[PDB]
Amino acid sequence: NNIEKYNQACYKAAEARKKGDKDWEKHKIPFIQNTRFTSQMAKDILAGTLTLEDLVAQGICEFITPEEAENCLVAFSIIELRKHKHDVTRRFTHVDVPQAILGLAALVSPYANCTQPARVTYETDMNRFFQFYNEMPLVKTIAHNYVIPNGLNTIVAYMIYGGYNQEDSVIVSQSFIDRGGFAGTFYREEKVEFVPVGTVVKKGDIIIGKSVMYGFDEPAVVDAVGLMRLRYERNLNIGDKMSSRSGNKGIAALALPTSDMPFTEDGLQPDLIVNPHSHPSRMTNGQMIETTVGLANALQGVVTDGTAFLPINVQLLSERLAQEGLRFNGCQKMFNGQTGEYFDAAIFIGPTYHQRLQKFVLDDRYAVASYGPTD
């Protein structure tokens, strides 16, 4: 800021008050606090010309530790710094980008500030999954410039369909599973401690390794002979757990053929059917905003940015939907795939990024029968 000039003019104005000038105000000057960051420099950073080291080299930036933080008054965003540009009551030492208060794991979720992870309550190649198909989210955050996204934009319908999606359950479509959605190979090798490579390793069989017994109960295949690698062709199974970027973990409770899934008057049908009762208490409004934005993004064939703390106006997004040709609220006319009758209410359906959590049903199921090893 220019407080030294502000103060100096302040003294001069007061002296004129003692005098008969009566124009003391002319000496007073407005206070000014403004960062030296410039729109041009921001462009250079994206172009790669200007780096942080160069920013620190000039007086634009400097590092502040939690100790030195106690000597700093920071404007939470450029909006606040501008709002108090001429305010002498509140002088800021630094200005920060509001996204800085989140890590990559949190920054993955779009429109995070529109949700509270607080109500999202969570407290209390070996074994590695390789998923064939991954796609960039329609509403990407900044985090996806540094991590390769995993998951798929799955058309999700927020509706009550037979009651198989209650209590955080999900109704997947069998065709979506068959086509390769969330499908991959599960790898597990004996490692320390033969058989032909590519051999069906059934339960209770002998696989000599350098470990003959095999009792996993799920057929495997000899991938290699650190040797004796077994690979499983793992698809999406009833009981597998999927979750949206904003928490919202759900278990696949039912799979339906393409003929039984609901469809819109335009032929669009969902991959997932999420129960609307998941939203109210958990308040993942970011999921709804992502769906609304993604509808327009898909229709226009663009990928927009949904990083948290960026300015958001839901009314304008709905108006964008209306311009694109859909309804203002984004709902469509849907038909019951089983009876072919239209729902009396429009159904909110659109893309929503989903990923499968690495906890598989077949891994933890178990059954035993009245005999076996004993202590």
Binding site: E167, A253, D364, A367, V368, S370
Partner: protein, 94 residues
């Protein structure tokens, strides 16, 4: 640390009394994830076929039982419903 004691086995949550006598590991039991199913009554549970094949129910052959139990015996382990073992009363062997 290397203190194997007769009396050290009794106390604590992992001791004899609390882990062995009060509570026990058991056979003929299954564990799995749960899911919703609107077509199952309140007092019903949907059981996978493979688990129904692993776990068994013991029936004592008798004059009233024989006809109903014959299909299970004939199916064996080839087609569900079937069976896994039979205990002969004369030979006292399974």
């Amino acid at each position: 640390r290397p203190a194997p004691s007769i009396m050290r086995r009794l106390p604590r949550k992992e001791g004899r009394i609390r882990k062995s006598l009060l509570g026990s590991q058991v056979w003929s039991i299954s564990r799995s994830t749960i899911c919703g199913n609107s077509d199952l009554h309140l007092d019903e549970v949907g059981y996978p076929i493979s688990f129904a094949r692993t776990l068994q129910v013991a029936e004592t052959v008798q004059h009233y039982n024989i006809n109903r139990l014959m299909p299970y015996f004939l199916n064996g382990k080839r087609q569900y419903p079937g069976c896994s073992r039979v205990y002969k009363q004369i030979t006292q062997s399974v």
